[PDB]
Amino acid sequence: GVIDTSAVESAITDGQGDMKAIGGYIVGALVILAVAGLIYSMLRKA
Amino acid sequence: GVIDTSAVESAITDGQGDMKAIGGYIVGALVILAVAGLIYSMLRKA
Amino acid sequence: GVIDTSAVESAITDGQGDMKAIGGYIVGALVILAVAGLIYSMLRKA
Amino acid sequence: GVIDTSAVESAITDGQGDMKAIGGYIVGALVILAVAGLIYSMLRKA
Amino acid sequence: GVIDTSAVESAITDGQGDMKAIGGYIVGALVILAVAGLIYSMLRKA
Amino acid sequence: GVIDTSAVESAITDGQGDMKAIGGYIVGALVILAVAGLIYSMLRKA
Amino acid sequence: GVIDTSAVESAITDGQGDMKAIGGYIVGALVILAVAGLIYSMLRKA
Amino acid sequence: GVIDTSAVESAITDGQGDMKAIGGYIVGALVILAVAGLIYSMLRKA
Amino acid sequence: GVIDTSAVESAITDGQGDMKAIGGYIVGALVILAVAGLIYSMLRKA
Amino acid sequence: GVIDTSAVESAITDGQGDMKAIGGYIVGALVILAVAGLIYSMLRKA
Amino acid sequence: GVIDTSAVESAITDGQGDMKAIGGYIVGALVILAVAGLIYSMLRKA
Amino acid sequence: GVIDTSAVESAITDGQGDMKAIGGYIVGALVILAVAGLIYSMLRKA
Amino acid sequence: GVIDTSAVESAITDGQGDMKAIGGYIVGALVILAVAGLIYSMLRKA
Amino acid sequence: GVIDTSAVESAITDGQGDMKAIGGYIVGALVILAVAGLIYSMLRKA
Amino acid sequence: GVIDTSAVESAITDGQGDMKAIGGYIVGALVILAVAGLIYSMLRKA
Amino acid sequence: GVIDTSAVESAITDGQGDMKAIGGYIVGALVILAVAGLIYSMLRKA
Amino acid sequence: GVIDTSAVESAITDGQGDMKAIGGYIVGALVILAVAGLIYSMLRKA
Amino acid sequence: GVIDTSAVESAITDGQGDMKAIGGYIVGALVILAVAGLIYSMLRKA
Amino acid sequence: GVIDTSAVESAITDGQGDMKAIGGYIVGALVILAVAGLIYSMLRKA
Amino acid sequence: GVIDTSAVESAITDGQGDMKAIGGYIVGALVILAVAGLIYSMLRKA
Amino acid sequence: GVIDTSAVESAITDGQGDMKAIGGYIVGALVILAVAGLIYSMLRKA
Amino acid sequence: GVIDTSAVESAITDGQGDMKAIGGYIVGALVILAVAGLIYSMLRKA
Amino acid sequence: GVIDTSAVESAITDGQGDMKAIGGYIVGALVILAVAGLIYSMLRKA
Amino acid sequence: GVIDTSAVESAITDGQGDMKAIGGYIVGALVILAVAGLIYSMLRKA
Amino acid sequence: GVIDTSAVESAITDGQGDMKAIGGYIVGALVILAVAGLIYSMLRKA
Amino acid sequence: GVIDTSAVESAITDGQGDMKAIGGYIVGALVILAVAGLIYSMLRKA
Amino acid sequence: GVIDTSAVESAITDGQGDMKAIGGYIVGALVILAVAGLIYSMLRKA
Amino acid sequence: GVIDTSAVESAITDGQGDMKAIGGYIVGALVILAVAGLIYSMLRKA
Amino acid sequence: GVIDTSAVESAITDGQGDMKAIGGYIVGALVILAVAGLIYSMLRKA
Amino acid sequence: GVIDTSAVESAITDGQGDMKAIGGYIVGALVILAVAGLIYSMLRKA
Amino acid sequence: GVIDTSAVESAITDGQGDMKAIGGYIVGALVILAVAGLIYSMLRKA
Amino acid sequence: GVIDTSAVESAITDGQGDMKAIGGYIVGALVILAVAGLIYSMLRKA
Amino acid sequence: GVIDTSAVESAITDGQGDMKAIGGYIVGALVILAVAGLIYSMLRKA
Amino acid sequence: GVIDTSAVESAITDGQGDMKAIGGYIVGALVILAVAGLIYSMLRKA
Amino acid sequence: GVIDTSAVESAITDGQGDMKAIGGYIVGALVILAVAGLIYSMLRKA
């Protein structure tokens, strides 16, 4: 008997890897929101 | 295995790009508020 | 991919446009205050 | 798109209109002060 | 739209009305000063 | 499709209507201030 | 729809009512000033 | 087929009904603020 | 073969129809909020 | 394949259309506030 | 040969029928949510 | 030799035929779900 | 065939019933907020 | 020849009969879910 | 359906009640200002 | 023939019974959320 | 040998065809949600 | 509603009361001026 | 069926209870503001 | 962008204009004082 | 072996295509909100 | 419900109390002005 | 049959218990906001 | 003849018995989810 | 990333520009006050 | 259930405490104004 | 017969155990949100 | 004996291959959602 | 007789073993989701 | 069962801690305003 | 694992950067107010 | 059995770590708002 | 961070500059008063 | 909890300190007025 | 956990720093007022 759940070990790793990309780039756009929101609040402020 | 989360890299970029447009033009109108508010405060001032 | 945030470009422009109207006409009434205040201060003055 | 800030044009106008009434009638009472002050100063004068 | 600044028309009128009372009665006392001053100056005169 | 934003047309109208009442009666009390202020200034004047 | 801005009609009325009291009694003290000022000016006069 | 969104017609109506109560009674307290503010401004005035 | 997705055409239509009712009557209550909010802001205003 | 997102094109348009109505009529009431505020400030002014 | 899928025609109909009941009465409770939410928003509003 | 699999040709056809009925009427009930779900989502929405 | 969706009729009713309790008592606490907010605004007011 | 598939006619009927019981009582518990879900959503709501 | 916005009727009433207390006692201190201001103006007067 | 779906009648009943417990106790915790949320909103309020 | 999976080619095509209808009409109702949501957000907005 | 502007009635009264004291004692010193002025004028006279 | 929304009745009550504490103690600090503001205005006054 | 502060240019001008009227007519009464003072001093002179 | 997931390549593309339409037109209505919100804030501003 | 605006009753009282101190001591310095003014007028007198 | 939903009774209780901790400590920080806000308003006040 | 389906009576009973264990202990873990979810919602709440 | 706050640079500039107009023309009317005050003081002088 | 709003009792107390410090020290500077104003008025007096 | 659902008793226990870890550590990050949100609200506050 | 599960090795590989295509292109459309959601949130934001 | 279900004992054990690997590594990716979600919520938060 | 909401106890504490820093340093700048305002009022005073 | 919140580090920086621009240019207009206010106060002064 | 929720322990930690970065840098921009707001209030102040 | 309050340095300077103009020219008219007063006193003298 | 209003203690002190400078130097110029007024009165005297 | 509110410590410091500049230069212009007022009072004096 056996079952080489080793390719899982690896392939799941890439899953993690891309979620790091989407997880990152996604944040890149939340910053534009964030900053544009800081500026919006800056203008309406004074 | 694989998963080309490369079109994400790009497409998210445009998301950023338009948020820069809305983020910008939006501000364009906060300025009208801002300035019209400076002027309003100018008139009520004296 | 894409996203035509071009109608934004325009429509936000009208937003600016009317805020110019309200921004203007509003001031029209602050002048009545202003002037009626100059006159009030004229009368109480002498 | 659009936004009929035309009723503003008009309604703000009446705002101006009544401020002309208050602005006027108000002055009517500053005259009583004014004149009664001229007379007061007339009497204390001689 | 509207704004009945008609009760203003009236109420301001009474404001005028009482200022006529104070404006009058006030003068009543400036006369006592006035006359008592004429008499004072009459006595010190001769 | 559709959406009868007609009851809005009307109901908002009453909103306007009562704001005319509060907008009016409110002014009724600013007149008491106003006039009592004219009289106060009348008395302290002479 | 509706909105009974009728209790406003009334309650604002009392606001007017008390401002008439303060507006009156306040004047009561401006008279003491007034008269004591007439008398002061009477004494310094002669 | 069907769907009797008739009990909606009614029940939403009561929603409107109570919002008229809260909408009204709420205003009842803004009047106390309002009037007590007129009086406060009356006293600090003279 | 076949599949008469014609009763869908119709029945979905009523779905639209009632959502127009809820979509409408719902708005009816947002107006009470809206107007009662205009009035609330009217009172706290002056 | 396909997907006629054409009824969207239209129906969203009406959404825009009514928001223009609410967007307009709403403003109608902000004017009553606005003007009643100009007048309020007119009275407290003099 | 044959197969009388006629009792289907009918029985499925009742399925529709009760889903109209649940579909209706269910909505009855979403209205309580809805309205109680309008009122909640009414109170927190002013 | 032979084998008249012709009655198959036909009888299977009716099988198709009724599956069109069940296939249709079944959908009739998924619409009640569907629409009642649109309405449910309409109510919880606003 | 059949399906007694009658216990639904009833049980859903109680669901409505308790939502009336929570819907009510909930409001009870929004009033404490409301009133304590009126009072807070009363104190900061004068 | 023959085959009395008449006891089928009947016995299948009871099968239907009990499925009506399970079909019913089952629903009885989906209502507790349903209502407890309406209430849960009521509480988290306000 | 229903919603007992009756505890609102009452509780809002107390809100009014205390605002009458703060509204009153607050005024109590504006009188000390007021009178101490009359006296101050009395002394600087003569 | 037969099938005693009577133990179903009963056992499903207990299912209902415990869902009443979970349905209840669950709510017990939504109240802590609820109230702690009222208090949180109380503090941030003033 | 053989197997004419040609009627599949076609019949699956209609499957696609109706899913285009449901896929379309379904969207028709999401627009009512959508727009009624834009309007709802319009009203609560101002 | 209400507003007990009764403590005003009283407290303003004391304001009057002390202004009578200052108003009196003040005069006490204008007499010393007065008389010392009569005497001064007596001496320079002869 | 059932749902003991009785612990709600109670627990919400405490929510009310503490909001009375925060609602009270909060006011305690608005008084320090209030009074320190009366005194500040007392000093700048004379 | 923009802001037509042109109606200001004009309206302020009228403010100037009336202040010229009050500024003038006011002087008209200071002349009566002036001259009546010259005459008063003429008489007391000889 | 094989599997022509090429029609996927294309059909998914249209999915993208319409989401661009809804994604666009949707924004068209957020602009009406946006601008009507700028204007609303313009009016309440002055 | 409730709201113990009793600590207000008291704390506002101290506000009154200190305003009596400032109100008093303030006057103490107006007397130095007053008297030094009587004396100044005494000296310049003769 | 059975189902010991007794560990629920207990475990849910702790859920309540910790929400009391978070519910409490959370408030601890809203007080720092609160008080620092009272002080901020104290400083900007005078 | 015969068939002692009595060991079924019993053995099925244990099946019920363990499903009560799994049915219970399973719930034990849904509570950890449940409570940890209440707490999670507690923290994100305030 | 980015955010072209360049239109701000400019538009704020015009705000400055008009405030220069109002700032100027406003002064134009303070001169009429000023001069008419010099003249008033000239006449009352001699 | 519960909620220890006891740390509120205390922490709000310190808020009061520091407002007493700012409330006090603030006054310390209004005295410098006050006195320097008495002296200024002393010098310009004679 | 039998079935040792004893390893369930245990293994489910660990499931509970780790959910306590995730349930805990998860909260650890909601605190960073929480606190960073308190601080964010602290800064925007004053 | 034997069994060449080698064509499996390969054919499963293509399965992986296309799932990479669908897995990829699928994501292509989630980006349109994603970005259109960022933009939607951008507009509703300011 | 016999049957060595001992290799089951073992082989099932490895099944458990790998499910621990997949069960673990799987979680590894839910953490990236989790954390990237905490961060996403961090950014949109402030 | 359990849930160590102990790291909350602590971490929330730091939240309090920094809000004390911002709460403090913030005040540091309100003092510059405060004092510069005392001085400004000092200069404009005399 | 990981998450490159480094683009945040940077992009937030620009947010700061533009807020420095708006923060600056905004002030540019408060100076026009400021100075025009100094001049206004200069003219009304003498 | 087992489940190494140890990588959770760690990975969640980084989640905390970056939220500290965003939590920090975010604040960096609220300071620019804060300070630019102090300065804005400084200028409009005097 | 930063904030270029350098344009303040300059712009305030011009404020000073014009106040020097008004401050000067104003004096120019006080001289006409002054001298015309010397001459007036010259004539009435002899 | 806490709040170090100690930097207030100090910074307010300097506020006092400079007001002593302005309070002093200001007086320095009132002396020039004073003395130049004594001398003016000396010359016009004889 | 943590939160480096250290950049606050610093950045707020500059806020203080510029308010010292505006706080200073502002005063620079109040001196021109001040002195030009001393001179104005010098001229009108003699």
PDB file of N, CA, C and O in Angstrom, chain W residues 29 32-34 36-37 40, chain a residues 27 38-39 41-42 45-46:
ATOM      1  N   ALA W  29     -12.156  51.200  25.731  1.00  0.00           N
ATOM      2  CA  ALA W  29     -11.470  52.046  24.757  1.00  0.00           C
ATOM      3  C   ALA W  29     -12.371  53.138  24.190  1.00  0.00           C
ATOM      4  O   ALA W  29     -11.890  54.179  23.730  1.00  0.00           O
ATOM      5  N   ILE W  32     -11.935  56.094  26.432  1.00  0.00           N
ATOM      6  CA  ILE W  32     -10.749  56.907  26.185  1.00  0.00           C
ATOM      7  C   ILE W  32     -11.088  57.867  25.071  1.00  0.00           C
ATOM      8  O   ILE W  32     -10.739  59.040  25.145  1.00  0.00           O
ATOM      9  N   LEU W  33     -11.772  57.371  24.039  1.00  0.00           N
ATOM     10  CA  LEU W  33     -12.233  58.220  22.947  1.00  0.00           C
ATOM     11  C   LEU W  33     -13.128  59.278  23.573  1.00  0.00           C
ATOM     12  O   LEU W  33     -12.830  60.472  23.549  1.00  0.00           O
ATOM     13  N   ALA W  34     -14.169  58.798  24.243  1.00  0.00           N
ATOM     14  CA  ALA W  34     -15.165  59.651  24.871  1.00  0.00           C
ATOM     15  C   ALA W  34     -14.563  60.780  25.696  1.00  0.00           C
ATOM     16  O   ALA W  34     -14.718  61.958  25.379  1.00  0.00           O
ATOM     17  N   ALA W  36     -11.334  61.729  25.998  1.00  0.00           N
ATOM     18  CA  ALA W  36     -10.359  62.522  25.245  1.00  0.00           C
ATOM     19  C   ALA W  36     -11.112  63.482  24.324  1.00  0.00           C
ATOM     20  O   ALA W  36     -10.572  64.509  23.896  1.00  0.00           O
ATOM     21  N   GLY W  37     -12.359  63.139  24.035  1.00  0.00           N
ATOM     22  CA  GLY W  37     -13.205  63.967  23.196  1.00  0.00           C
ATOM     23  C   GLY W  37     -13.843  65.067  24.010  1.00  0.00           C
ATOM     24  O   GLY W  37     -14.127  66.151  23.503  1.00  0.00           O
ATOM     25  N   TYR W  40     -10.902  67.367  24.544  1.00  0.00           N
ATOM     26  CA  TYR W  40     -10.620  68.064  23.292  1.00  0.00           C
ATOM     27  C   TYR W  40     -11.642  69.188  23.180  1.00  0.00           C
ATOM     28  O   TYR W  40     -11.274  70.350  22.976  1.00  0.00           O
TER      29      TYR W  40
ATOM     30  N   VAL a  27      -8.991  35.672  16.424  1.00  0.00           N
ATOM     31  CA  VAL a  27      -9.409  36.795  17.244  1.00  0.00           C
ATOM     32  C   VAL a  27      -8.222  37.725  17.477  1.00  0.00           C
ATOM     33  O   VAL a  27      -8.381  38.949  17.468  1.00  0.00           O
ATOM     34  N   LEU a  38      -9.655  51.870  16.727  1.00  0.00           N
ATOM     35  CA  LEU a  38      -9.908  52.758  17.852  1.00  0.00           C
ATOM     36  C   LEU a  38      -8.967  53.948  17.682  1.00  0.00           C
ATOM     37  O   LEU a  38      -9.384  55.110  17.719  1.00  0.00           O
ATOM     38  N   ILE a  39      -7.707  53.644  17.386  1.00  0.00           N
ATOM     39  CA  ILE a  39      -6.690  54.661  17.166  1.00  0.00           C
ATOM     40  C   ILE a  39      -7.019  55.508  15.949  1.00  0.00           C
ATOM     41  O   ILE a  39      -6.893  56.732  15.999  1.00  0.00           O
ATOM     42  N   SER a  41      -9.930  56.076  14.743  1.00  0.00           N
ATOM     43  CA  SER a  41     -11.030  56.928  15.173  1.00  0.00           C
ATOM     44  C   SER a  41     -10.573  57.966  16.196  1.00  0.00           C
ATOM     45  O   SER a  41     -11.224  58.995  16.376  1.00  0.00           O
ATOM     46  N   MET a  42      -9.459  57.698  16.871  1.00  0.00           N
ATOM     47  CA  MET a  42      -8.915  58.642  17.839  1.00  0.00           C
ATOM     48  C   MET a  42      -8.350  59.836  17.074  1.00  0.00           C
ATOM     49  O   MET a  42      -8.699  60.984  17.348  1.00  0.00           O
ATOM     50  N   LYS a  45     -10.768  61.888  15.122  1.00  0.00           N
ATOM     51  CA  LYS a  45     -11.613  62.522  16.131  1.00  0.00           C
ATOM     52  C   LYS a  45     -11.142  63.929  16.464  1.00  0.00           C
ATOM     53  O   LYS a  45     -11.914  64.884  16.400  1.00  0.00           O
ATOM     54  N   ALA a  46      -9.863  64.054  16.794  1.00  0.00           N
ATOM     55  CA  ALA a  46      -9.292  65.340  17.156  1.00  0.00           C
ATOM     56  C   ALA a  46      -8.069  65.719  16.343  1.00  0.00           C
ATOM     57  O   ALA a  46      -7.921  66.920  16.079  1.00  0.00           O
TER      58      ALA a  46
END
